[PDB]
Symmetry: C3
Subunit: 342 residues, 3 copies
């Protein structure tokens, strides 16, 4: 296949998307059949029947077993063929289908598409806020026609806020930014404190009313490959970013093909937990910003890749590209390390 | 090199599809202009004008001659340029267009897309029942986005009936009771007799007799490349076979591209010959079996070919795959034999 | 792909440009075309130097095209005139490629190749389009065929007898008199349809006047793919040198190897104040060009794979002289350029 970092955990779906009716979805050019078994456990099988290659995702569950819609072979969550209705009903090993390591955690469905012997659920990113009773989480799914790295670049960058999300987050006090970049093992963080300018649209609706040279906060954490969690906050007194009013944003990308990807987004609130109106506001921003703004930009950039590559054009970095560049380099190393292993 | 067996007869159309208005259709990646001349004889020309390559199929007949819609060159059924309206009206040999051997027989339009010197109308499969006054034939055409071999596999197989054609073709009285596969020269037959009695709703209404147990038959014949004729029958007591209530089903495939094909189907009844109403029902059930059922499965499988090939995945055969496997091997040989020739 | 990059091509009609950028691809090169506040047209590579966003999706800010992604601003020459980030430094690496552009004869010409070779002496003459003595109407069409197929089409005005049958058929066809004049960077194909019944279309040009007449359908080709035809019809043996006519603009600009832009127009010498005659011409352009010719060339493009896979070559007729010579000139230009770099 192309260049993907297969040895890592990726989100394949949101829990609400799975049920007894299989979901067919492609991850890193690998077609998967994702479904929840009767015992509530999620299973992930290669969406290719071992017999004649029909999509198992088009089948239904029979006694908790996924049945191939073509000739009826039945499989368990581990991919073992548990029933062959033909002939003497023999089930040779050649009839088992490939099963992928899968972990449901933090209201996310994680999958390991690479070497199964190398998985290890302990390396899965921490998105605990998504199931923390102290937070209220709302979110969704989006499909985007761009290489996932373009969206990683996007999420790791604050600059476009002023233009891409013009109508929304356009701080007239964005000329006085400050951004710290922390590098760790398979982890990078861009932290920013913002003490100035009475909001505009976004934070406004999140807020109520305040003013002082020290309030806002905008941060983002990146974990190995393409899983990010941001931190959007605002508060009164010289109180730490803690005790503040904030939303931790889930922004996770999973490559589908070399030129397309899956986008799992969400907002985990610390305020208005029982307020349905805020839920709307948040979902209204996600649909606007992430689906009606960032998508348009990255999809247009993807359409220009052929030209940039055909010619020897390289990007010209600005002062605000530090975080994105470092993440980009880490992802590159991971690709090389894996290619070397091969 | 998409790999087609060019030296063989293929159905390019049903008689009802042809008239004085040319039909443009691609067979084995070869664009053809098919039309019936004023004398009623069908002609098949390469759909590429010798002059500047315009589609002759977009032209009209002028005095029984197909006129190119671009600059007016006129051709006869043999591809000879019979009129050049330009200059001195000279007609050099370079102006003739390629003509394909074509035979209208058994209410089918047969064409030889390969080496014309090797044709021979005598090798054409026998589908006499289609024009036998003792039978009533109804049928149609269907386009499918799958390599033709996937549909050949399908037609040569009885095991998916229960799941794909779920009920209409379902029969718990089908089980698995000895399927005889006879291999000939350019012909293969899969014979299956089911002593138990379970006649379709249509044929049962003809058993009459005087209350008697009945046997049933589900046979199919395959001829060189991809032309099949099945035998669905039922009869009482000492069930002979040729004196039973039956339908001979025409199921012929013709490759369009490497990943698409033409499907010509039909039913030749031996019962209810004077039931125009029954005509619509039988054609509708075949259309349903193709469009809403077999098509969905084979097109999904075609969508998985890239992955299976990129990886080294081979199919895992079951007890019920004997007939399909043998036909598949015969087609393979034919490809090799032809590849060896040139 | 094989394109002759060192030549002027029409990238748009003036009416298509404004302060809102137009994104259009020419010879596989994405362009951002727009008219600055001073009225001057600019043509920039539609790829921001920073992170490659389409500048054509941006808006003008103080006469400067602003990238919609992170706000870099550029002038008509591609110079980055404003960087809102950091210390606002503007290193040379931030400038975007600008293409030589000339607005002339109600056409927007662009040089997509080596900018140092842009030789304006080569911009074709289409003066009739802005000559107050003529009335011009026209439009744009996108076609899914290699541009050379449409060049062949336009250089064979004879196809009108069949392709444009319902409007161009003539009974005096077998009496045609065609000649081919070759010259320095220019080729002309002349056609004369002697004293015959005016064609349906020529009838309209003559407000329904079915009386013996002489017809003319000439065409001029200039370096690469810019053509201007001459459709005239006049009584008995009157001279065409001074007749009722229409000079047809037929210019093609490759988009990709298998697609192109078609800029067409009609510059009348009659019924200048007759809007119904405008409709007659627009109708013809919509039917014949955007439909009739398109249907034919698009079908031919669909057969290229087969013809090439096999070793099929076209069989030329007596009426192919002009098209063949133009085809050979274009070939030479490709070779000359391939030889250069
Ligand atoms: O989608 C988010 O997590 C988000 C929100 Cl809720 C508010 C503001 C910004 Cl700049 C965001 O990126
Ligand atoms: O499609 C057919 O030829 C057919 C018919 Cl008409 C009746 C019953 C069965 Cl089981 C068939 O496979
Ligand atoms: O659009 C044109 O220039 C044209 C007209 Cl008006 C009449 C006939 C032909 Cl063949 C043309 O190409
Ligand atoms: S393809 Fe799955 S049982 Fe046959
Ligand atoms: S392409 Fe057929 S006559 Fe010219
Ligand atoms: S991509 Fe244009 S300013 Fe960033
Ligand atoms: Co079980
Ligand atoms: Co069983
Ligand atoms: Co079986
Ligand atoms: Co954004
Ligand atoms: Co004849
Ligand atoms: Co079937
Ligand atoms: Co300025
Ligand atoms: Co034309």
């Amino acid at each position: 296949m192309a260049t993907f970092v297969r040895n890592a955990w990726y989100v394949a779906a949101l829990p609400e998307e799975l049920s007894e009716k299989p979901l067919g979805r492609t991850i890193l050019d690998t077609p998967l059949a994702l479904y929840r078994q009767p015992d509530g456990v999620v299973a992930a099988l290669l969406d290719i029947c071992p017999h004649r290659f029909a999509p198992l995702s088009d089948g239904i569950l029979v006694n908790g077993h996924l049945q191939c819609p073509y000739h009826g072979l039945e499989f368990d969550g581990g991919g073992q063929c548990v029933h062959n209705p033909h002939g003497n009903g023999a089930r040779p090993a050649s009839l088992n289908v490939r099963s992928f390591p899968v972990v449901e955690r933090d209201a996310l469905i994680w999958i390991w598409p690479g070497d199964p012997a190398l998985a290890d659920p302990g390396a899965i990113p921490d998105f605990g806020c998504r199931v923390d009773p102290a937070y209220r989480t709302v979110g969704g799914y989006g499909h985007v026609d761009c290489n996932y790295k373009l969206l990683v670049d996007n999420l790791m960058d604050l600059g476009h806020a002023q233009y891409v999300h013009r109508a929304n987050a356009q701080t007239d006090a964005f000329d006085r930014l400050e951004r710290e970049v922390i590098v760790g093992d398979g982890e990078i963080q861009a932290l920013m404190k913002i003490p100035g300018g009475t909001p505009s649209v976004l934070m406004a609706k999140f807020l109520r009313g305040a003013n002082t040279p020290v309030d806002a906060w905008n941060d983002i954490r990146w974990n190995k490959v393409s899983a990010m969690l941001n931190f959007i906050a605002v508060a009164p007194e010289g109180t730490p970013k803690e005790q503040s009013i904030h939303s931790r944003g889930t922004h996770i990308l999973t490559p589908e093909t070399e030129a397309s990807c899956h986008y799992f987004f969400g907002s985990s609130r610390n305020f208005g937990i029982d307020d349905p109106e805020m839920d709307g506001v948040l979902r209204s921003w996600q649909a606007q910003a992430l689906v009606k703004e960032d998508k348009v930009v990255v999809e247009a950039i993807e359409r220009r890749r052929a030209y940039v590559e055909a010619n020897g054009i390289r990007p010209a970095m600005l002062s605000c590209d530090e975080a994105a560049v470092r993440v980009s380099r880490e992802i590159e190393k991971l690709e090389q390390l894996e290619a070397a292993r091969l």
